[PDB]
Amino acid sequence: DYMGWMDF
Amino acid sequence: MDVVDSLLVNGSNITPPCELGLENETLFCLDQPRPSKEWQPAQVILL
C-alpha cells in the first residue's frame, strides 16, 4: 500500500 | 489534496512522461497514476 511506506 | 491540486493532476506521479505515438500502450518512463490523489508523491517528500 502507498499510505503504508510511512503511514505515520 | 488541498495543498497543490493542479500539480497532483497535470503530471500527478513522480515518474516523468515519455509518450511515443507509434506505440499504442505507452509504459515508457511513466507508470500510469493509480490512485490519483496525494499517494506516492507525498510519501517521497516524507508526509
Nearest to B46 among A2, A3, A6 (CB): A6
Judge if the upstream peptide bond of residue B41 is cis by omega within 30 degrees of 0: no
Q: Which three cell numbers stand for residue A4?
A: 503504508
How many helices (DSSP H) and strands (DSSP E) are in chain A? 0, 0
Resolved by: NMR
Residue B44 gets the label, from left (phi > 0), alpha (psi -120 to 50) or beta, of alpha
- What is the three-state SS of B1-47? CCCCCCCCCCCCCCCCCECCCCCCCCCECCCCCCCCCCHHHHHHCCC
- Sorted by where each starts, the structural domains of chain B and their CATH numbers stand as 1-47 (4.10.670.10)
Our CA angle for A5, B37, B9, nearest 5°, is: 130
Other C-beta atoms closer than 10 Å to the C-beta of B8 total: 18
Interface with chain B: mutation pick from A1, A2, A6, highest number of B CBs within 10 Å: A2
* B42: closest chain A residue by CA: A3
Q: Which three cell numbers stand for residue B40?
A: 506516492
Judge if the upstream peptide bond of residue B33 is cis by omega within 30 degrees of 0: no
A5 and B39 within 8 Å at the Cβ level: the answer is no
